[PDB]
Design a protein around this nucleic acid. Structure first.
Length: 94
DNA sequence: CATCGTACTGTTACGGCTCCATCGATGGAGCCGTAACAGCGATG
């Protein structure tokens, strides 16, 4: 199943260039090293920017929970041979 | 020019009968293309 899905995605990339499911190969596309965090809106901001968190006692746990939720969702997919192991890097920042 | 002789022949108009030539369109159904609509997990 993994081979069939990857072959279909590779053919779609070679012929057209972009399609659904292209987000799972973000690490390969951007050339990032394994385990590196993805570029985000904070990276777009200048290094001398100012950050304000409104209702911090609620916002901060929301920031924390995204990575755990995404990893829990993707663990079953990667385990059962549906997506490549590199799909773990298409994750929100810890 | 006058009179007489036991119901005369042939050729044309006109009405009725019959044969023959001459002559796509509309609604229903199926299909294609296009627009429209409905229908996981972790944390505090």
């Amino acid at each position: 199943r993994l081979e069939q899905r990857t072959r279909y995605d590779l053919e779609m990339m070679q012929e057209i260039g972009f399609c659904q499911g292209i987000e799972n190969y973000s690490r390969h596309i951007s050339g990032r090293a394994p385990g590196s965090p993805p570029f985000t809106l904070i990276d777009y901001f200048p290094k001398d920017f100012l950050l304000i968190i409104d209702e911090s006692h609620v916002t901060i746990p929301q920031i924390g929970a995204m990575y755990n939720g995404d990893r829990s969702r993707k663990e079953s997919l990667v385990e059962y041979g549906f997506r490549l192991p590199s799909a773990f890097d298409n994750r929100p920042l810890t």
